[PDB]
Amino acid sequence: MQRVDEMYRLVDSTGTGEDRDWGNQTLLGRLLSQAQTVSIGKK
Amino acid sequence: MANSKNSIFVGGAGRVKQTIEGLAQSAFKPGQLLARAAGDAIDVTAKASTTYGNEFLICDDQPQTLGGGTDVAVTAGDTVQAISVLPGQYVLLSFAATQNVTTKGAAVASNGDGNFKLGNPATEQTFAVTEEIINVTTAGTLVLCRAI
Amino acid sequence: MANSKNSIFVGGAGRVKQTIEGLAQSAFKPGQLLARAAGDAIDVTAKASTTYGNEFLICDDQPQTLGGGTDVAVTAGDTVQAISVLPGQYVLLSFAATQNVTTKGAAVASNGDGNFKLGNPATEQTFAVTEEIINVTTAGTLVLCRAI
């Protein structure tokens, strides 16, 4: 429960962050979906 | 303690209080003399003792659901709920140091620091009248007084 | 105008007024300081500003069913319904010219002409306390004040 010096406020810590942008990763979302997979170490 | 002093407005069972809201400027304790200033802010009076025409405006204790008592100081820069005292009510004031109250009915003047004192009623404004026979030594003790 | 000023007694929702009837002598406007005289007649005060012991007696607005408002003057030689102000009520007074009200809580003295003014509370009787921050220039404007 709460104390008696905190009965004047009700809270809700559901949380909401930030929105990213508008058209953020449209190009990179197309390149990384058609990409060829090589082995690591090949620089 | 048979005389519990945990409410600053004890003035009858049918008389409601008159409240003057406003903003804070400092952190004063409940039961001290106030004076409204420019803007909409309240603080301690800091006027002279020999000046008349002042309004009986004391600091009410803050609500229980905001961390308020008869000794908890107020938080600065916020809404301080105060009390304008009508004539004929009992209120708990706050006296200064080194004065004893012997007879019920002496004159209650106002010290310059925001506390009260027993002064001669010929050169200062008489606010209230004593109603309890106690002797105080530490500045900031609550003494019952009738506002007439 | 969000502050409608068409009733001279606006002093709480539970506080009734105290009425002093009497006869007229002149045609004064509602909201001015009065003083009862010999016989049973009331008129404007016309006492000095530096005289104490005067009763807080202002002129109530006349009833709606007799041609009364907050600017309609009374008819001479008739029954003028007035108001005796208890301490702790708000009433609309009427100030004189060329004075600005800056802080809520200044002292309200009485001018000699039947209007009010902001005077020094050391040589005149303090009637009320200001409750509205406005600046007046024409003599006869209604300013809210608390009677304590």
d(Cα C90, Cα C80) in Å, to the nearest integer?
A: 21
Contact state of A4 with B66 under an 8 Å Cβ cutoff: no
End-to-end CA distance of chain B: 27
Rg (Cα) of chain A, in Å, rounded? 24
The two tokens of residue C4 are: 């409608």
Contact state of B36 with C105 under an 8 Å Cβ cutoff: yes
d(Cα B33, Cα B37) in Å, to the nearest integer?
A: 13
B92 in Cβ contact with B70 (< 8 Å)? yes
C96 in Cβ contact with C117 (< 8 Å)? yes
Query: Largest alpha-carbon pair distance within chain A?
Result: 65
CA B133 to chain CA centroid, nearest Å: 18
Q: What is the DSSP letter of C121?
A: T
Q: What share of chain A is helix, strand, coil (3-state, %, to 5)?
A: 15, 0, 85
Q: Are strands C128-130 and C141-146 parallel, antiparallel or unpaired?
A: antiparallel
Exposed, middle or buried by CB within 10 Å (0-12, 13-18, 19+), for C110? Answer: buried
Q: Is C126 near chain B, with CB under 8 Å?
A: yes
The two tokens of residue C10 are: 């606006």
Q: What chain B residue is nearest to A9 in terms of C-alpha separation? A: B65
Q: Are strands C57-59 and B141-146 parallel, antiparallel or unpaired?
A: unpaired
Q: Is B14 near chain C, with CB under 8 Å?
A: no
Q: Give Cα separations from B98 to B101, B139, C22 (angstroms).
A: 10, 8, 53
The residues spanned by each domain of chain C are 1-148
Chains contacting B (3+ CB pairs below 8 angstroms): A, C
Q: What chain B residue is nearest to A2 in terms of C-alpha separation? A: B65
Q: Which of C77, C83, C93, C101 is nearest to C127 (CA)?
A: C93
Contact state of B66 with A8 under an 8 Å Cβ cutoff: yes
Q: Which of B37, B54, B86 lies nearest to residue C87, judging by beta carbons?
A: B86
d(Cα B113, Cα A32) in Å, to the nearest integer?
A: 74
Question: Resolution of the deposited coordinates, in angstroms?
Answer: 3.6
Q: Is C67 near chain B, with CB under 8 Å?
A: no
d(Cα B114, Cα B32) in Å, to the nearest integer?
A: 5
Method: cryo-EM
- Reduced to 3 states (helix: H, G, I; strand: E, B; else coil), residue C70 is coil
Q: What chain A residue is nearest to B67 in terms of C-alpha separation? A: A5
Q: Are strands C116-117 and C107-110 parallel, antiparallel or unpaired?
A: antiparallel
How many other CB atoms are there within 10 angstroms of residue B90's CB atom? 20
Q: Which of B74, B62, B82 is nearest to B22 (CA)?
A: B82
